[PDB]
């Protein structure tokens, strides 16, 4: 933003918005997969209790 103009800067930002949002979608997928594995262990721990 301290270097480009709104009609051509936005293409540089749009790549970054994509790549950062993609990295959150990776994290939330990886957390949903680990969280299913912790649950599988919590329901086992509840069965041993």
């Amino acid at each position: 933003f301290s270097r480009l103009d709104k009609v051509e800067a936005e293409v540089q930002i749009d790549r970054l918005i994509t790549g950062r949002l993609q990295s959150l979608q990776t994290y939330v997928t990886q957390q949903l997969i680990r969280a299913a594995e912790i649950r599988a262990s919590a329901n086992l721990a509840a069965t041993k209790m």
């Binding site: 301290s2 270097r3 480009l4 103009d5 051509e8 800067a9």
Partner: protein, 49 residues
């Protein structure tokens, strides 16, 4: 007088304030093309060398 293209000159502009607006008002120099900065931003930046 200017340099021949193989003998091309190069000068350090340093330790000074650089204004595009006063040049453009002076300019019969009727072209421009930038590659990593917007023309609209050139008066608001600052530069290393």
């Amino acid at each position: 007088r200017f340099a021949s293209v193989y003998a091309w000159n190069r000068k350090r502009i340093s330790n000074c304030v650089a204004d595009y607006s006063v040049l453009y008002n002076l300019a019969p120099f009727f072209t421009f093309k930038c590659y990593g900065v917007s023309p609209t931003k050139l008066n608001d930046l600052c530069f290393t060398n």
